[model samples]
Target: NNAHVDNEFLILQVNDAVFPIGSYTHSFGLETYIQQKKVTNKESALEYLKANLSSQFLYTEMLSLKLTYESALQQDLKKILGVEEVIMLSTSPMELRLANQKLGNRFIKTLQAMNELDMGEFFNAYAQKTKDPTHATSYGVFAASLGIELKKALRHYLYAQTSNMVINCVKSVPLSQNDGQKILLSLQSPFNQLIEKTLELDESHLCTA
Candidate 1:
């Protein structure tokens, strides 16, 4: 058997944790935070996710997504590549940078395989001429290429990334899977608030982001 997955719907396919793109592997650098005793308990982990969701994620990945979606919508490969460069600039610790790039490559491959986005040729051509883009950038392109609204896609992407990180916390920290579900569910309100803030995102506020 080919290990059939219903994927009864498009959103159903990508919304699950086991989307076959290795979502389980990403800690989003949370393992280091847990090791440093910053997220020792469920409450602390939720707070950490909240903090990053609002601030750090604003200027770094989300900003890249905004710009990437813009460029992708415009069908400008040069600007898309530019967004790729600008986004990766924020990923200082080399590990995070490589992680984002690797994740972007994975999404490109898998999305192409699934016929989810039409960026395979463009991405291949761009990769031949430029550094591979960040996953955040790829996500924006994926959304734009498929005609998904940026705000909706941004909200969904943040939720997915946050939920996946919660699962990571469950695995690496002493938290329970139920705790992970609780954390994921609890972030709904914050996610809405953040999505609103994201619409008004100003990249110049990066330091304060």
Candidate 2:
């Protein structure tokens, strides 16, 4: 038992698949690989997961998360908006943008209570500034407001998405439950390494992909 117990508990709840952010509704283009038969087996599925981690996950979402968390921590609305705009611009596809926007909107709506939450005003201010926000931006701000450790937030965020991706692979690739768990188990080391790398990232790193 520690001061972080509540933070840890809430973090898991918020990031859980059933949290109602509708994360599963979007594949983030992974379905294309499934359609092309590129990810038909556990072996190929692992490749897709690794490539996703090193490239887009690291460069875009994690970078945005880092920047958003820092900006939120400083109570810099303008900086947060700046990060939001960059995230909006960096993502290319219309569907992808809409997906993130939908998820972000749901995220804010779910937590924008009238009660006193640490750094809660920033959330309202952010909503007033932009109707469309990305999931990374919303998550970063909420995690900061809830007083979750930045690295813990980042790791859980990545882990949730990674698990969600594997679930999608399991469904589309028709892999067994054992295979899905195996893939998830293999990602622990890479997850830690990537979190360290993400911590080193700054505003310069956003949207580099």
Candidate 3:
């Protein structure tokens, strides 16, 4: 059954679901850029999303996700903590950091409410010690708790993020509905390429925003 729910299927469901780890509220710094008139048109919006995906998501967030997922698979708390620390230190912007923490916190709470797994103790212990889990860590927690395979989890998360970014672009740029669909369709190849490249990356070489 688990094997039947492959990476592509999981990604499709996650993208279609309303429970997207609070992605609807956060533009991941695009709000500020838009406010400053830095990103107004379709071209600018696409550029912003591309920069974010290539730099922030590809480098920092993806690396964190990979690290957390692998560490959770190994049940290595020490490695998880290290990855979390790296994520925290690498994020330079205040708003971006807050966005990550907010999403991370809410995602953990959402999973806990489902009574899916025994994450309360791990979450509580981390909170009590003042350790803030990054968004990627929370995603890892979700997947590991659900016993999702690493490859599936990674691909699903990446695709959801990529698709969401374009969705935001569709609204913010007031792009034609057809244009949005075309853009989404065009992203398939690049997404696959990025996924392959990401799988080969190490933490040290990871992209940073």
Candidate 4:
């Protein structure tokens, strides 16, 4: 289907670093680490990234994204809201949680402004129910509305998040642009496994993430 090409294009556009989602504004606690010199260099930065991937992002954001994507595909609004609530509650740290909310809210607003892609019934319904959507949850709805495949959606979502973190590191840690590229390149290897685990996880384990 030539629609496949269109879907790929839309996915890239939404996940683009310059999409104006305000992702560049938040470090998600990385700034604190940087000030402490814990992630001062490339090697330390890479290690910090690895920790976030395996520990935080994998179990939390990615898992929520998977559940929300599946719920949106099934058009189960209740499940979508339930998963969103869980993710919002499970997420700790004032700055991190607020960051997701602002990013998600902006994502929806920007998509609406585009007036290009149809967000579909389920998304519009959820939007009415939630004034402040979490980034991954809104992204799940966005990706599903675009008719993107779940795995591919997760892949691009993970890439975009990783890239955001790398950019934050590049600017805050003062890492070179080359170092950011290297860090992003190294992240691709673990993505498949992370997506697999996210897809395989059960709803009961949602908060454990």
Candidate 5:
């Protein structure tokens, strides 16, 4: 029981955006849409973020994390490998792909340096067999190996990515600090429920995404 709580606590530290990783650079196209003037102001920025949250982050990224976590949990290397290939292929946009890959690379190297394993290095051996580089989803899989449930790991992934979007908007846009906090505060309740829905949905559903 104590150990399980520590596992979830460790998840929190890892997901904390400022934990030695550069998430400010990771708007995941939030600023790109703004650069094109698609997100002109507070109102438009809200819309852009909501659309990304509802569409891609919910359907695509969380889906991959859930699958990878469970696939790693099952000790199914073939399935894990398949998920890696699909993840690398599905992420288009060279900038976004490179961002995800760099984050993934950083995560893998950090985790490899850690001196123990609760299960096995499923993430290490399988995710490395990708056509292209990996993403933080590899870290998601690795989190599962460390005794986190697939659902909690998925939530952590979404939370980190979502918070990065908010912080990016605050820094690069004309929006005020209060406005950015408001946006993040608004999403918290909805996203809590959203994580449950993302976890409830089947892996077969969005694997093609």
Candidate 6:
């Protein structure tokens, strides 16, 4: 079996495009640090990125991605809701929470516009009933409906996080474009290991920090 065949190539190509999730307008929680004068320099920005990757992304967001992927595989609504609630409770920053919801909503909207996937109807119904849809849940539903494997979906999501943060840092700290690329290149190994660790996460370890 050619595992690195057409499907993987298609996944890579789709993941490369900007999904119009309003990603450029948001910096997750980095904006807060910038406002506090805590991450004004390039070095400080790098450190802040490292801390965020280690603490929040590694533990919280990555876990959410993995769990969401798994839930999609099972098509278990209970597990899906469980993961969504946990993610909602885990985010302490209002901006971060709002960013996830905003992007998730836009991602779904874009998909609906591009392709009339059935999951879009389900998402719309859920959103109407709850007044808000959880980002991870929406992502999980979309991935399942799209026929994307769990591991591949999780990897793409993690890669997006790493790439976006670097872009955000470049614009905020005014880092040279070359420097930003350097940071991204250096993150490859850690990102791989973090993905592995994320796969091993246990539900009991989930906590809002």
For each candidate in turn, the TM-score is 0.81, 0.90, 0.77, 0.89, 0.82, 0.78
- Candidate of highest TM-score: 2
lDDT of 2: 0.81
Instruction: Output the worst ten-in-a-row residue range by lDDT, candidate 2.
Output: 111-120
Query: Candidate 6, residues 1-209: lDDT per residue as tens digits?
Result: 22333556545744564655566323757677877889776677777777787776666666766665566566555666676677776665777677777766776676556442345344444444432344455665667655777777777866776777888878876678888888888778877787677777866655443
How large an RMSD does model 5 have? 3.2
- Judged by whole-model lDDT over C-alpha atoms, candidate 3 comes out at 0.65
3 or 5, greater by lDDT? 5
Tens digit per residue, CA lDDT, model 2, 79-145: 8888888778777697878888888888877766524334457767877786567777888887887
Off by over 4 Å in 3: 1-17, 24-26, 32-44, 116-130, 206-209
Q: What digit string (tens of lDDT, one per residue) describes model 5 on residues 1-209?
A: 23433775678877776565445334656657877878767777777777777676666677677777777777887776676666666777877777777766666666556545343656557646644435555765777777777666766777777777877787777689899889888888778777877777655666443
User: What is the RMSD of candidate 3?
Assistant: 4.1
Error of 4 at 207 (Å): 3.3
**lDDT of model 1 at position 200:** 76
C-alpha lDDT (0 to 100) for residue 209 of candidate 5: 33
Alpha-carbon RMSD of each model:
4.5, 2.9, 4.1, 2.6, 3.2, 4.3
Tens-digit lDDT string for candidate 3 (8-97): 544454445476467633365566787688877666766676667677677777767777766666766777777777777777687777
Question: In model 6, which runs have C-alpha deviations exceeding 4 angstroms?
Answer: 1-10, 24-26, 35-37, 40-43, 116-134
Cα-based lDDT for every prediction:
0.70, 0.81, 0.65, 0.79, 0.68, 0.65
In angstroms, the error of model 6 at 40 is: 4.8
- The per-residue C-alpha lDDT of model 4 at residue 58 equals 73
In model 2, residue pairs whose N, Cα or C atoms come closer than 3 Å (at least 3 residues apart or on different chains), thus clashing, are none
Residue 87 of model 6 has an lDDT of 75
Badly placed stretches (over 4 Å) of model 5 are: 1-5, 21-28, 116-121, 127-133, 207-209
Taking all chains together, the TM-score of candidate 2 against the true structure is 0.90
